C-alpha cells in the first residue's frame, strides 16, 4: 500500500463481498459503498462533481456550494468542501436526522433550516424555493442539483460502476440498485452493460416514492425514494422495478446483519428484501450484483429500533 | 481488487495519509484505523483473539465470549462474534454511550448492565465482579480479558504494526499512540522497532488516567485512559509520556477536521494535541507515525458538541 496525500485518495476502491450465507443458491455480490471514508456512497458524486467544477473553472476557492439535502449527500459535500477549502450551505428541513445534522455542522458547513411547510405539510417546495433564494443572493455559487446534474450519474459510471466490471468479470445476470436521484443505477448500469450487455437492470424503490409513479404514502427512510421524478432518470434503461415498504426494508437490514455481520442502512435492507423477491423468479445460480450505500449507524432510531420496527409492521 | 468471502477479509490494510496541512514542517503519517469495517481499531484484536482461540481449540461454536467493555471493543467483538456464530455478553455500566449500546444490541450481543456502583461511585469494581460471576455461571466461556491478554498486543503487532513498516520504510523518528489497554502501543512499537530500532516510542494518555500514575480526575473520553495499570504494559518500552486533558483532545479533533477534513474520535484529538506538543521539542522535518483509532460519529455529544467543549474548557 502507498501513502495518500489526502483523505480524497481513499474515496472508492471499496470492498466487494459475496453473501454466501444470506443467498446460498445464487452468487450475490455486494459492493460496500458504505466503506467510503465519509461513510456513504455519496462520497462518489461529492468528490466527482466538485473536482469537475474546479477543473473546468466553474468552481474556484471563492465559489459557495449550495444543495438541498438529506443527511448523506450533505455529509459527503461537507467533507469534500472542507478538504477543498470551499464554503457550503446545506438547505435542510426539520425531518433531517438530528445526528446527521450535527455531523454536517462538525464539518463546518453552513445550514439553512427551512421552517415553513407548504399548506399541505411537506417541506419539499420550501426547500426548492430556499435553494433558489440562496442562488439569487449568494454571489458566486454552484448548485449541486443532484436530481438533474449529469455529473451525478457520471460519478457512479466512473466510480463503483467501473470497479464492479473490473472485479465481477463473470457475466452479471442482474444488477440491483436502490433509487433516489437514480444517479447510481443510471451510471453503474451504463458501465456494467458495456461489458455485460445482457445484464438485467433492477431498480428498487420505497413504497410511496413517486420516481416510478407509486401512490404517495408517508416514507420513513432517506436515500431510497423521492418526492420528484429525477431528471437524471431514463426509464428505458430500467428492466424491472420492485417496491418495498419500510417494514420489509428494516427486516432486510436485520437479516443481513444476522446472516453476514454487515451492519448497513435502510436502503440496503430494501435491496435485501428486493433480492429475496427477485430470486423467487430467476434461475438458481444466477450472478447478482448490488450496492450497499451507507451504514447502520445512521439508523439506530429507525431500522434498528425495535419500537420503530413494530410501528412499521403496523403500517402494513 | 478481488472478492471477499466475508466482511472479515476487509479488516486491516487501512489507508495511511500524510497530514500536510496540519503539520507543514514535519512528515506526519496517520494510519486510519477507524476505516476498519466495524468502525474502529478494535476490529484488529476482536478478529485476532477470536480466530486464535478457535484455531487452538479454546473457542468452539458453543463457547460464550465474555468481556467488560466500553463501546468500541464491544462493537468489534459483537461483529466478529456474529460472523463466527458465537454468543457474546458485554458487561457494561451506565456511563456507556447510548448509541454505542444500541450498536452492540443491533449486532445481537447480550448486554449485562451493572447498576450498583461501589460506595465511591465507580462501576469498575462492579464490572470486574460481574465478569467473574458470568465466568462462574456460564459454562464454556472465554474471557477476552483485554487488559491482560497477550493476543491483544499481538493483534496490533501483526496488524497495523506490520502495515506501518511495510508502508513507512523510511526511518520512523517518532511513533505516537494513545493508550488504554496499551495493546496498540506495545504491539505496534515492537514491530516498528524491528525495522527502525531508533524509533522513539511516545505514549499519549488522558489526564487523570492511572496507566502512568497521573492523579485521578473525572475523565470524559473512552478508549484513551484507564482506571487500572494494564498487565500488557511494559513501561521500559515507552520513551516519552504526554498527558492531554479533554479540552485539549477536543480542540485537536476540531483542528484535524478543519485542516484535513478527517472526522475522528476523542483519542485522535489527544494525539493531535500531543504531536503539537512534541514538535516544540524535536527536529524540523522529522518523520512521525501515528494511529487514528475511531470516527467522530461516536462523539457528537462529546468533542463535537459546542456546549460540551465549553464545559471542558471550564475544567482546565
Ligand atoms: C443516495 C442514496 C441512495 C440512492 O442513490 P441515488 O444515486 O441517489 O439513486 C440510496 N441509499 C442511500 C443511503 C443513499 O444515500
Ligand atoms: C482502544 C482504543 C484506544 C487505545 O488502544 P489500546 O490498544 O487499548 O491501548 C484509543 N482510542 C480508542 C478510540 C480506542 O477504542
Ligand atoms: K433544489
Ligand atoms: K425528494
Ligand atoms: K474484567
Ligand atoms: K479502565
Ligand atoms: Mg458457493
Ligand atoms: Mg462574494
Ligand atoms: Mg470514485
Ligand atoms: Mg512537503
Ligand atoms: Mg452450555
Ligand atoms: Mg488485522
Tell which B residues from 241 to 280 touch A, by Cβ distance under 8 Å. Answer: 257-258, 260-263
Cβ distance of A9 and B17 shorter than 8 Å: yes
Closest by CA position to A19, among listed A10, A32, A7: A32
Q: Are B17 and B32 within 8 A, CB to CB?
A: yes
Which of A34, A71, A72, A270 has most ligand 1 atoms within 8 Å of its beta carbon, as the pocket-test mutant?
A72
C-beta atoms surrounding B98 within 10 Å? 11
Tell which B residues from 166 to 195 touch A, by Cβ distance under 8 Å. Answer: 166-168
Which residues are CB-contacts of B56 (< 8 A; sequence separation ≥ 6)? none
Cα–Cα distance measured from residue A69 to residue B109, given in angstroms and rounded to the nearest whole number: 34
Cα–Cα distance measured from residue B279 to residue B26, given in angstroms and rounded to the nearest whole number: 8
Breaks (C-N over 2.5 A) in chain A follow: none
The residue among A2, A17, A74 with the most chain B CBs within 10 A of its CB, best to mutate, is: A17
Torsion, Cα A123 A127 A133 A136, to 10 degrees, reads: -160
- In terms of Cβ atoms closer than 10 Å to its own Cβ (0-12, 13-18, 19+), residue B288 is buried
A contacts of B19 (beta carbons < 8 Å): none
Q: What are residue A293's DSSP bridge partners?
A: none
A136 half-sphere exposure, CB direction, 13 A CA radius: 6
What are phi and psi for residue A176, nearest 5 degrees?
Answer: -120, 120
**Residues lining ligand 2, judged by CB closer than 6 Å?**
B 40-42, 72, 178-184, 223-224, 265, 267, 293-294
Angle between helices B183-195 and B150-158 (to 10 degrees): 40
User: How is residue A40 annotated by DSSP?
Assistant: B
- The residue whose CA has the least distance to atom 14 of ligand 2 is B223
Q: Which three cell numbers stand for residue B312?
A: 471542558
Question: According to the entry, how was the structure determined?
Answer: X-ray
Among 3.40.50.1100, 3.30.70.2740, 3.90.550.10, 1.20.1430.10, what is the CATH number of B1-35+160-308?
Answer: 3.40.50.1100
B contacts of A16 (beta carbons < 8 Å): 1-4
- Do domains B1-35+160-308 and B36-146 share one topology? The answer is yes
| Sign of the CA dihedral with A258 first, then A261, A263, and A264 last | negative
| Sign of the CA dihedral with A31 first, then A37, A39, and A40 last | negative
Nearest CA in chain A to B80: A261
Q: Give the per-residue SS3 of A151-169.
A: HHHHHHHHCHHHHHHHHCC
Question: What is the residue whose three cell numbers read 511516545?
Answer: B202
Cα–Cα distance measured from residue B164 to residue B156, given in angstroms and rounded to the nearest whole number: 10
Q: Which three cell numbers stand for residue A295?
A: 451504514
For residue B116, give how far its alpha carbon lies from the nearest alpha carbon of chain A (Å).
27
Cβ distance of B32 and A35 shorter than 8 Å: no
Task: Show me where the domains of chain B are located.
Answer: 1-35+160-308, 36-146
For residue A229, give how far its alpha carbon lies from the nearest alpha carbon of chain B (Å).
32
Let me know the angle formed at the C-alpha of B42 by B36 and B43, rounded to the nearest 5 degrees.
45
Which of B33, B181, B238, B303 has most ligand 2 atoms within 8 Å of its beta carbon, as the pocket-test mutant?
B181
Q: Are B241 and B200 within 8 A, CB to CB?
A: no
Q: Which three cell numbers stand for residue A231?
A: 431528471
Radius of gyration in angstroms for the set of CA atoms belonging to chain A, rounded to a whole number: 19
Q: Which three cell numbers stand for residue A285?
A: 445460480
User: How is residue B285 annotated by DSSP?
Assistant: T
Sheet holding B110-113, edge to edge: B110-113, B88-92, B64-68, B141-143
Q: Are A248 and A273 within 8 A, CB to CB?
A: yes
User: How is residue A299 annotated by DSSP?
Assistant: G
Any CB–CB contact under 8 A between B37 and chain A?
A: yes
Q: Which ligand is nearest to the CA of A129?
A: 3
Of A82, A258, A296, the CB nearest to B108: A258
Closest by CA position to A40, among listed A12, A8, A9, A66: A12
Cα–Cα distance measured from residue A170 to residue A187, given in angstroms and rounded to the nearest whole number: 20
Instruction: For residue A93, give the 3-state DSSP assignment.
Output: coil
What are phi and psi for residue A145, nearest 5 degrees?
Answer: 60, 55
Cβ distance of A37 and B32 shorter than 8 Å: yes
Cβ distance of A3 and B13 shorter than 8 Å: no
Let me know the angle formed at the C-alpha of B259 by B258 and B263, rounded to the nearest 5 degrees.
55
Q: Which three cell numbers stand for residue B4?
A: 471477499
Instruction: Please determine, looking at this structure, whether the domain spanning A36-146 carries the CATH number 3.40.50.1100.
Output: yes
Which DSSP string do the residues of A276-315 spell out, in sequence order?
A: HHHTTTS-TT-EEEEE--BBGGGGTTTTT-HHHHHHHHHH
Amino acid at each position: 500500500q502507498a501513502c495518500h496525500d489526502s483523505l480524497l485518495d481513499s474515496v472508492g476502491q471499496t470492498p466487494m463481498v459475496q453473501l454466501h450465507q444470506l443467498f446460498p443458491k445464487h452468487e450475490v455480490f455486494a459492493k460496500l459503498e458504505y466503506m467510503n471514508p465519509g461513510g456513504s456512497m455519496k462520497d462518489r458524486p461529492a468528490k466527482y462533481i466538485i473536482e469537475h467544477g474546479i477543473k473546468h473553472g466553474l468552481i474556484t476557492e471563492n465559489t459557495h456550494l449550495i444543495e438541498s439535502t438529506s443527511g448523506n449527500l450533505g455529509i459527503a459535500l461537507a467533507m469534500i468542501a472542507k478538504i477543498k477549502g470551499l464554503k457550503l450551505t446545506c438547505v435542510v428541513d426539520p425531518k433531517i436526522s438530528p445526528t446527521n445534522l450535527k455531523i454536517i455542522k462538525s464539518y463546518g458547513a453552513n445550514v439553512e433550516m427551512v421552517e415553513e411547510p407548504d399548506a399541505h405539510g411537506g417541506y419539499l417546495m420550501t426547500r426548492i424555493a430556499k435553494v433558489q433564494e440562496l442562488l439569487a443572493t449568494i454571489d458566486d455559487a454552484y448548485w449541486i442539483n443532484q436530481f438533474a446534474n449529469e455529473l451525478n450519474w457520471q460519478s457512479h459510471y466512473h466510480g463503483a460502476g467501473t470497479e464492479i466490471v473490473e472485479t465481477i468479470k463473470q457475466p452479471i445476470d442482474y444488477f440491483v440498485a436502490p433509487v433516489g436521484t437514480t444517479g447510481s443505477i443510471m451510471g453503474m448500469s451504463r458501465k456494467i452493460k458495456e461489458v455485460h450487455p445482457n445484464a438485467q437492470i433492477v431498480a428498487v424503490d420505497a413504497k410511496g416514492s413517486v420516481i416510478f409513479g407509486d401512490k404517495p404514502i408517508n416514507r420513513e427512510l432517506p436515500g431510497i425514494g423521492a418526492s420528484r421524478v429525477p431528471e437524471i432518470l431514463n426509464r428505458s434503461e430500467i428492466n424491472q422495478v420492485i417496491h418495498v415498504d419500510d417494514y420489509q426494508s428494516a427486516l432486510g437490514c436485520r437479516k443481513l446483519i444476522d446472516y453476514e455481520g454487515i451492519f448497513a442502512g435502510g436502503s440496503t435492507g430494501s435491496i435485501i428484501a428486493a433480492i429475496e423477491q427477485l430470486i423467487t423468479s430467476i434461475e438458481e445460480g444466477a450472478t447478482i450484483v448490488t450496492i450497499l450505500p451507507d451504514r447502520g449507524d445512521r439508523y439506530l432510531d429507525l431500522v434498528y429500533s425495535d419500537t420503530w420496527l413494530e410501528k412499521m409492521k403496523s403500517r402494513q
